[model samples]
Target chain A: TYKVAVLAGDGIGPLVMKEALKILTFIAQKYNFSFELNEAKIGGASIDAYGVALSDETLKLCEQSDAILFGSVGGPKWDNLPIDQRPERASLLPLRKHFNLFANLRPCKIYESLTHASPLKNEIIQKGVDILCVRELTGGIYFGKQDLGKESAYDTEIYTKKEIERIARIAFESARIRKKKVHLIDKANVLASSILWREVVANVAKDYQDINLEYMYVDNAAMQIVKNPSIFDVMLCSNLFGDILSDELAAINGSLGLLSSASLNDKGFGLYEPAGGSAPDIAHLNIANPIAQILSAALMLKYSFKEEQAAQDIENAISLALAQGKMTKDLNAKSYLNTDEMGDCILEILKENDN
Target chain B: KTYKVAVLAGDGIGPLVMKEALKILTFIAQKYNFSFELNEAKIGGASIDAYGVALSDETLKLCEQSDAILFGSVGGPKWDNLPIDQRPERASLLPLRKHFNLFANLRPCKIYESLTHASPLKNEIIQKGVDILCVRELTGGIYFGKQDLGKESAYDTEIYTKKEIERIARIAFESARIRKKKVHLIDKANVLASSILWREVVANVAKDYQDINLEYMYVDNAAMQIVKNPSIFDVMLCSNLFGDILSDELAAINGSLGLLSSASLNDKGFGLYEPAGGSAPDIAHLNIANPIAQILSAALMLKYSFKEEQAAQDIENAISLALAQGKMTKDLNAKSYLNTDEMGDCILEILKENDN
Candidate 1:
C-alpha cells in the first residue's frame, strides 16, 4: 500500500485532482492493490481557510506520506497578497527544503497529433520530441553569494563536485529507462562553475557506461532544441541554465497542460505536480484538462512507490486516448470532451489496455 | 572617394564567401561613385600555418591603417588544439577587439517573408514578420570577470560597472532610431547586482532619448519571449553573456546562421563586420555554403563604417529578392538549389536589374 498526500491548490486544481484520484483508485483496484489518499488544503484554499498557504496539519500529513501529488497553485484571488505570504512563495520552497528536494525531473514530450498547439514547424515535430530535463534545483547562481554594492554588484556561480555528482547520477538513472543519451548542457568554455559541471558530470557518466554521453554549450543546445528537438533524450543542467531551458523545453512542446514534473531528494522521496498554473478562469466549469495531474500521479507511482508497471499502464492509457483523438478542447481536437468525460475516456482505455 | 578596408578572409568558406562580398562591394562602389581601397591580410589558422601564430605584426599594422576590418570567421579542427590562448579565435579576434576598444556588438535577425518555410517556427508565429536587432555589450560580465578554480569547487563572478552599462545602453537607444524606436534592456535586476546597476544606468540613458520607448525584461523571461514571439521586439539589448546566447537563439529561429550578419564597433564608428556563423570546414570549397551572410556583412560595413545606408539597403533588397525567387543554397533546398557563387550571382543580377 502507498500513502500519498493529495494537496490540491486553487482554481481547477481541486477539479483536476478529483479526476486524477479516481483514475489512480481505478488502476490500483484493477491491478489488485490499494493506496491511501490524504487530502490537504494549499494556495488560495488554505489562504481562505487559515489565512496562510501551508498549514501545520497539512505539512505534517505530507511528512508522513510516501509521496506528495500536488495540483497547480496560485490564482488571481491571491494575486495582490503580501509577497512572502503568497501560495507558491510560502508553501513550495519551504516544503522543498523540508523534504531536501534538489533535483527536478521534467518530461517535455510532444505528440505528433498535438503539433497544432506548438510553435515549431510540422516537419520538426513529426520526428518526435521527448526530452527529460534533469535540473539541479538547490545550487548554482540562483543561490550563490550576492554582493550588492553601490557602484558594482556581483553574483557568484559556484558549484562543488559533490553537488554536480548527485544531480549527474539522477540524470543518468533517469536515462537508464530512456533513450540512453545524456547531454551535459553547460558553457564549459567559460564560467568555472560550468567547467566543474562538465568535469563532474563526465566522471558520473563512467558509472553508467551504456549511456551515450555528450557535451554541448548551453547556447548551441538551445539552437538544436528549436531546430531538431528529437535528437535530445535527457539534458542535465545546473540551476541557472535549467531555469531558462526547462521553460524553453515546455514551450517547444506546445502546451503546459500535458506536462508533469517531479522533484526528488536523496531519499528517493518526490513531490509530483503539473508544469502549469491553476486556470482560475476554468474553475468548477469541468472543462479543465486533467492529464497533467493524472500524469503527476503516474510519476508518483513510479518514482516513490516503485510501481513501474502501473506507471506504464497510466501513460499507455493517455497515449491511447490521444491517439484515438479523444482529447480536451484545449488541444484543439475536432472530437473533444469535457474534463470529467476525458478522464472517463482515459479510464476506459486503461481498462481496455489491461484486460 | 576611397575608404580603406583590411579584408581578413580567414579560413575554409571564408575565402569563398569573401569573393562574392568583394564583387558586391566593387559593383556597388562603382555605381555609387565611391571606391574601397582593399588590403588583404592573413589571420586565424591560415596565418598560423604560414607564420606559426594566429596574428602577425604585419596584419596588426595593416588593420591600423584601414578604416575598418572586414572579417570572415576563423578556427576549425586543424587548429582546434592550438593552446587555448594561441587558438585562432582567442589569439586573433580577442586582441583586435581590445586594440580597437570595440565595446558594442550588433546582430540583426531578419527572416524574409518568402523564406518562412525555412524557419523552425510555424508560418503563423512569424506571419506578422520577424526582424530583431540585438545589441550586446562585448567585453564585460562573467566572461571577462574574475574566476576562482579549486579542487573541490569553483566560482565565476558576474560583474559590470556603470560606465560599461551606460555605453552599451546608448548603442541600443541610438540603434533604435533606425529601428522601431523600442529598446528592451534584458537583465536580472531582481537577483543580480550587476543587473541593478545596468537598469539604473540604462534608465538614465533613456532620458536622453525621450523619443524612444524603453522597457526592462528579466534574462530568463527574455529567453522565452524570444522564442514565443520574436517579431514583437524591435531591439533586444543585453550584456555579454545574454547577448551571446540570445543572438544565437535568434539566428536559429531565423532558419540558419548563413543569413545573419553582425558588427562589432567602437565609439568612433570604426568597426569589424562579419557573418554570425563559424567556419564550416566540412562543406568548405564545395560551393554549397550560403554566401548571403558574408555579403550582408559587406553591406553592414558600408552602413556602419562608411555611413552608406542606401547602399546597404540595396544589398539587403537584392538578397531578399533572390530568396523570393527561390535562388537559395543547398541548406535551404537540397532538391533544387544554387551553389555559393551562383546564389551571389543571382543576387548581383537582381541588383543590376534594380539599377537598370
Candidate 2:
C-alpha cells in the first residue's frame, strides 16, 4: 500500500478534496492497489486549531508519506496576521523549504472545445499550444540577498553550477517522456547569471543525447508564447523568469480554474496542487471545479508512485468526461454539473475504460 | 529658417530606405515652408570600409552639431566576426546614445483599422484597438550594470539611483498628458531593490500630475496584459530590460514592423528617430524593402525635435490612408506590392491631395 498525505487547506479546499478523494478511491479499486490516506490540516485551519499554519506534527505526517496531495491555501481571515504566521508564508513556504522542493512544473495545454475562450485567433489556436514550464523555485533573484535602503535599493541575482544542473536535468528528463525538445529561456546576452545558466544547461544537454536542446532569450520567448505557442515543448527557466512565464502561460490558456502544478525535490517526492487560489465566497456552495485537484492527484501518482499507466488512465478519464460535456460552474455556469456530480462523471468514465 | 539634420544611413537596406525618408523630408519641407540642411555621415559597415572603424570622430562631430539625428537601421552579417566593440551596433548605436545622454527610449505600437486582420488576437480583442506607447529607460538597469565575468562564477549588479528613476518617470507622465491620461509603471518591487527605487520615484512623480492616473504592475503581469488586453494601456514605463522585452512583444502583436517608429531623447529637446526594425541584408539592393518605417521616423523627428505637430499628423494620416487604399510592401502579404521608391511616391502623392 502507498501512503498519501492530503492537506485540504482552506475555503473551497475541503470541498474539492472531497470530490478528488472519490475519484482516487475509484482508481485504487480498479487498479488493484490500496492507498493509505492520512488527513492533515494546513493553512488557516491549522492556524485556527494550533495557532500555527503548519505544525510539527503535520510536517511529520507529510514526511512519512510517499506523496502529498495539496489543495488551495490562504483567505481573508489570515490576511492581517503577522508575516511569518500568515497562511501563504506559514504553510506553503515552510512545506517547500522543508521538502527541498526546488523544481516547479506547470503545464499549459488548451482543450479544443475551449479554443474560443482564448484571446488568440482561431488559426493560432489551431496550431496547438501545449508547453511545460520547468521553473527553478528555490534559487535566483527571489530568494537571493536583497538590500533595501533609504537612498537606493539593490538585489543580487546569483546562480551556482549545482542549481542550474539539477533543474536542467529535470527539464531534459521531462522532455524525454513528452516531446524530446527543451528550450532553455534566459537573458544570456545581458545578465551574467543567464550566461552561467546557458553554460551549465549546455553541459547537461550532453547527457540526454537523444533530446533536442535550444536556447532562447527571455524576451523572445515571451513573444513566441503569444505569436506562436506550438513551437514550444519543454521550457526551462530561472526563478524570476519561470514565475513570470508560468503565470503568463496559465493566463494564455484562459482557463486557470483547470490547471494543475507540481513541486518536486531531488528524491522524486512531490507536492501536487492546483494552480488556482481558494475561493472563500463559494466555500460550501458545492459548485467549485475539481478538475485541477483531480489532475494534481494524477500528477502525484505519476511522479511519486511511478504508476504511469494508472496516471494516464486518470488523465484520459478526465479528458473524456470534459469532452462529453461535463463541466462545473466556473467552466460553464449555464450548462454544468455540481462539484460531486462532476467527480461522479469522471469516475463513471474511468470504470468504462476498465471494461 | 533652416534646420541642420544629420542623416546616418548605416548598412544594407539602411541606405535603400534612407533615400525614401529623404524624399518625404523634401516634400514636407516644401509644404511647411522650412528648409532642411541635411549632412550625410558614415557610421556602420560603410565607415568600417572607409576608415577601418565603425564610427570615426568626424561622424560624432557631425551628429553633435545637428538639430536632430535621423538614423537608418545598422548591422549585418559581414561584420559579425569583428571584435565586440567594433561591430556596427556595438560601435555606432551605443556611443550615440551615451554621447547624447539619450536615456529615454519611446516605441509606439499601433495597429491601423485597415490592418486589424494582421494581429494574432481575435477580431473581438482587436476591435478594442491596440495603441500603446512603451516608454523605456534606455541607459540604466541591468544592461549597463557592473559585470564580473569569471571562470567559475559570474555576477552582474543591478543598481539604480533616485535621479535616474525620477527623470524617466517625468518622461512617462509628460507623454501621458498628450495621449491617454494613464501611466502604468512596470517593475518588480517585491524582489529587486532597483525596482523598489523605481516605484518610490514614480509614485513621487505622480504627485505633480494630479490629472493623470498612475498604476504599478509587476513586469510579468504587464507581459500577460499586453497579450490579453492591450487596449487598456495608454502609456507604459519600464526599466531597460523590462522595456526591451515588453516593447518587442508589443511590436510583434501589432504585426507590422515597417509601420513602427522609435525615438531616443535626452534631457534636452533634441531626439534621434529611427525605424524599429533592423537592416535586412538579404533584401538590401532589392527594391522590395519596406520604406514606411523610415518615413515614419521622419514624422517622429518633426514632432519631437521641431515640434511640428501639424506636419507630423499629415505624414501619419497620409500613410494610414495609403494603407487603407491597399498600398503596402511585401511584408504585409499584399497582392500588388510596391517597391521602396514607389511606396514613397504613393505617400507623397497622398500628401499632395490631403487637403481634402
Candidate 3:
C-alpha cells in the first residue's frame, strides 16, 4: 500500500481537492493500487490553527506519505505575516526543500484545433507547438551563495559539474522519448557558469549520440521561442532564466488557468500542486478554476500510487468531456458555472467511465 | 529648382536605385521650392578603386558643404576582400556615425494596411496592429566595448555610465510621450551588474516624468513578449547589444526586407539617415535590388538636414501616395503596377502637387 498525503490549502483549495479525490479513490480500487490517504494542515489554515505555517504534525504526515497533493496556498488576508511566516514562504518553499525536487519541467504545447487562438501567425502555430523547458530548480543564481543587504547586494550564478551532468541527463532522457532534440541555452560569451554548462552538455552528449544537441545564446533562445516556438523540442537552462521564461511561456500558452505541477524526491516522495497563486478576490464565490488542482491529484495517482492505466483513463475522460463541451466554468465559453457544477460534471463523467 | 543633393551612388544597384530615388526627390523638390542638385561621388567598392579607401578628404569636404547627403546603397562582393581599415563598408559608415555622434537609433516597425498578408503571424495578431519604435543607444555599450585579446582567448568589457543611461532614458521618455505614451526599458538586472546600474538609473529618471507610463522588464522576457504579442508594447528602449538583436527581429516581423529606415542622431545638431539593412553582397550589382530603403533614407535626410519638415512630410506623403497608386518596389510587391522607377516617377508627380 502506497501512502498519499493531502494538503487542502486555503480558499478554493478544499473544493478542488474534494472533486479530485472522488475520482482518485475509484481509480485506486479499479487498478488494484492500494492508496493510504493521509491529511495534513498547511498554508493559511495551519497558521490560524497552530500559529505555525507548517506544524510539526503536518510535516510528519507529509514524510509518512508516498506523495502529497496540494491545492492553492495564501490569500490577501495572510499578506500581513512576516516573510518567514507567510503562507507561500512558509509552506511551498519548505516542502520543496524537504522533498529535494530539483528539476522543474514546464511543457508548452498547443491543442490542435485551438491553434487559431494563438497570437502568432497561422503558419507558425499550425506546425504544432510543443516545447519542454527543463529548469534546474534547486541551484544557480536564485539559490546560490549570495549577499543580500540594504545598500548593496550580490548574487552568484554558480553551477557544479555534478548538477549540470544530472540535469542534462534528465533533459536528454526525456528528449529521447519525444523529439530527440535539445537546445541548450547559455551566455558562454560572458558568464563562466554558462561556459561550464556548455562544456558539461558536450561531455554528456558524447555518451548519448542518438540525441541531437544545439547551443544558442540565452537572448537568442528567448527570441526563437516567440518567433518559432514550434521548432523547439526541449529547452534547458539555469534557475533564474527558468523562472522568467516559465512565466512567459505559461502566459503565451493560455493555459495558466488550468496547469498542474509536481515536485518529487529521488526517494519517491512527491508533492503535487497547481501552477497558480491563491486568488482571494473570488475565493468565496466558487468561481475559481479548479482544473489544475484536480489534474495535480491525477499526477499524484500516477507518479506515486503506480496506478498507470487508471491515471491515463482519467486524463482521456477529462479531454473527452472537454471535447464534448461539458466544461463547468473556466473552460465553458457559452456560460460560466459554479464550482460545484464543474465538480459534479467531472464526477459524473468519471462515474460513467470508471470500471 | 531641384535641391542640390550630393548623391554618393556607391556600388552594386547603388547607382541604379539612387538615380530613381533622386529622380523622385528632385521632382518633389521642384513642387516645394526645394530641388536636388545631384553631385555624384563614388563610395564603398568604387571608392577603394579610386582612392584605395572608403572615403577621401575631398568627399568629406563635399559632404560638409552639401545641404544634405542622399546616399545610395554601398558594398558588394568586389569589396569583401579589403582589410579592416580599408574595408569600404565599415570605414565609410563608422566615421559618419562618429562624426555625427549619432548616439541614438530609432527604427519604427509599423504593419501597414495594404501589407497585412506579408506578416508571418495570423491576421488577428496583425489586425490588432503592430506599431512600435525601438529606441537603441548606439555609441556606447559592448559594441564599442574595450577589447582585450591575447594568446589564450579574449574578453570585452561592457561598461555604461550614469550619463549614458540618463540620456537614453530621457530620449525614450520624450519619444514615448509623443506617440503611445509608454516606454519599456529592457535590462538584465537579475544577472549582470551593469544591468543593475541600468535599472537603477532608469527607475530614478522615470520618477521625474510622471505624465508618461513607464515599465521595466528583463531583456529575455522582453524578447519573448515581442514575439508572443507585439501589440503589448508601444516603444522599447534598450542597450546596444539587445537593440542589435531586437531590431533584426523587428525587421523580419513583416517579411518586408529592404523597406526599413533608421536615423542616428547626437544631442548636437548632427545626424545620419540610413537603411537598417546590412551590405548585401548577394544581389549587389543586380538592378533587381530593392531601392525603397535608400529612398526612405533620402526622405529622412530631408527632415534632419534642411529642417524642411514640410518637405519631408511631402516626400513621405508622395511615397505613400505612389505606393497607393499601384507603384511599389520588389520587396513590398508591385502594388498598382510599380517597378522601382515607376514608383519614383509617381512620387515625383505627387511632389509637384503642392497643397500650399
Candidate 4:
C-alpha cells in the first residue's frame, strides 16, 4: 500500500481528480496494490475556507504522503487579490519552496498520429519529438532577491556551484534512462552565471563519458525548437531559460492536454502535475479533458512509488486509446467523449489488456 | 535628383553580395529618373588590413555626410584571433550604432506564398501568411548594462528608464500603423521591475495610437506564440534580450533567412540597412552565396532611408516575381542554381520588364 496526497484545488480540478481516482482505483484492483488516498484543499478552495491558498494543515498532509498528485489551480475569482496572496503565487510557489523541489522535468513528446496537429511541417516532426527538459527550478531569477526601489529595481540572478552541479546530475541521470545526450542551453557569451554553469556542467560531463554533450545559447535554442525539435534529446538550462524553452516545447508538441510535468526535490519525493492549467473556462461543465491529469498520475507512480511496470502500463493504455481515436474535447473539439466517458474508455482498455 | 549613400561592403561574401545590391540600386536609379552618388568605404577585415582598425574615423565622417548607410556583414576566421576590442564584430557595428544613435532595429519576416514550402511550419499555418515586423530596442537593457565580476560572484544589471521605454514604444506603435493595427509588447512585467516600467511606458504610448490594438505577453509566452500562431502577430515590441531571441525565432520560422533584411534607425532619420546574416568566408567568390538578402536590404534602405515607397515596392515585387518564377540561388537547391550575379541579373530583368 502507498499513501497519496490528493490536493484537488480549483474550478476543473475536482472534476479531473475524480477521473484520475477512477483510473487509480482500477489499477489498484488489477495489480493487487492499494492506494491510501487522502484529500486536502489548496488554491482557491483553501482561500475560501481559511483565507489563504495553502494552509499549515494541508501542507502537513502533503509532507506525510509518499507523493503529491496536484490538480490545477487559479481562476478569475482570485484574480483581483494581492500579488503574493493569489492562488498561483500563494499556493504553488510556497509548496516548491517548502519542499526544495529544485529540479523540474517537462517532456516534449509528440505522437505520430497527432503530427498533423503540430504547427511544424509534417516532415520536421515525422520522426516524432520526445525531448525532455531538465530545468533548475528553485534557484535563479525567480527566487533571486528583488531590490525594488522607487527610481529603479534590480533582480539578482545568482547561482552557486552547488546548485549547478545538482541540476547537472539530474540531467545526466535522466539522459541515462532515455537517450544518452544532454544539451546545456545558456548565454555563456554574456552572463557570468552562464559561464559558471558551463564550467561546472563540463566537470559533471566528464563523469558520464558515454553521454554526448552539446552547448547551445538561449537565442539559438529558441529558433531550433521551432525549426527542428527532433534534434534535442535532453535539454538542461537555468530557471529563466528553462521556463522560456519548456513553454516553447509545450507549444511545439501541440497537445498540452496530454502532457505531464514532474518537480522533484533532493530526495526521490516529487510533485506530479499536468502541464496544462486549471482551464476554468470548461470547469464542471463535464467537457474538460482528463488525459493530462491521468498522465500526471502515471508520472507519480514512476517517480514516487517506484512502480515502473504500473506506470508503463498506464502510459501504454493512454497512447493506445489516443491511437484508437479516443477523442477528448481538447483533442477534437467537434467530436469528443465527455470527461467521465474518456476515463472509462481508458479503464476499459486497461482491463481488456489484463484479461 | 541625386542621393549620397555610403556603401560599407566589408569582406568575403559581403563584397560579392554588395555588387549585386549595387546593380539593383543603379537599375532603380536609371528607371526612376534619379541618380545615386555612391561612395565606397572599407570596414571589418578590409579596414583592419588597411588602417589597423575595423572602421576608420574617415569612414565614420563619410557616413555622416551621406543620406544613409548601406552595410554588408563583417568578420571571418581571419579575425578570430584578434583581441576583443580590435575584432571586426566587436569594434565595428556597435560603434557605428553608438555614433548614429541607431536605437531602433526592425526585422521584417515575410513568407512569400510561393516559398511557403521552405518553412518548418505546416501548410495551414503557412497559408495564413507570416508577415511580422519585430521592432527591437537596441541601445539599452542587459546587453549595455553595468557588469560587475568577482571571484565568487558576478552580476549584470537590466535597467531601463522611462525615456528609453517610451521612445521604443512609440516606434513600435508607429510601425503598426502601416501594417496591421496590432502591437504586442513582449516583456516579463510580473517578474522584473524594468519590465513594469516597460509596461507602463508602452501603455502611455498606446494611448496616442487609439486606432491600433495593444496587447501584452510575457517573453516566455511570446516565444511559444511565435511558433504556434505567428500569423496572429503584426508588430512585436521587445527589449534588447527578448527582441534578439524573438527576431531570430521569427527568421527561422520564415525559413528564408537568406532573403531577410534589417534596418537600424536613429532619431534623425539617418538609418543603416543590412542583411540579417553574416559573411560566408568559405563561399566567398564561389558565386554560390545568396544575393537576395542584400537586395532586400537595398529595398529597406529605399523604404526607410530615402522614403521612396514606389521604388521600394517595385524592387520588392520584382524580387517576389523572380522567386515565384523559380529563379533561386544555390541555397534553395534550384535545378540550375543561378550564380550570385546571374540571380541579380534575373531580378534586374524583371525590373526592366515592369518598367516597360
| Candidate number achieving the greatest lDDT relative to the actual structure | 1
Flag the better candidate by TM-score, 1 or 3: 1
Per-residue lDDT of candidate 1, residues A187-232 (tens digit): 8888888888877888888899999999999888888878888999
Number of the candidate with higher TM-score, 3 or 4:
4
- Model 3, A240-353: lDDT tens digits are 667656765664565566677776555555688888777777787777776677777766666566555666677666666666665655555577666666666776777788
Write down the DockQ of candidate 2. 0.67
User: Can you list each candidate's DockQ?
Assistant: 0.68, 0.67, 0.17, 0.58
Q: Report iRMS (Å) of candidate 4.
A: 1.9
Please write out the lDDT profile of model 2 over residues B182-243, one tens digit for every residue. 99999998778778888888998899999999999999898888877889999999988889
Off by over 4 Å in 2: A77-80, B149-152
Model 4 has a DockQ score of 0.58
Least well predicted 10-residue stretch by lDDT in candidate 2 chain B: B147-156
Candidate 2: give the clashing pairs: none
Tens digit of per-residue lDDT, candidate 1, span B86-193: 989889998999999999999998999878988999999888988899999998888878898787899998888887888888888988987799999988888777
In model 1, residue pairs whose N, Cα or C atoms come closer than 3 Å (at least 3 residues apart or on different chains), thus clashing, are none
What's the lDDT for candidate 3? 0.71
Q: In lDDT terms, how accurate is model 4? A: 0.87
Better of 1 and 2 by DockQ: 1
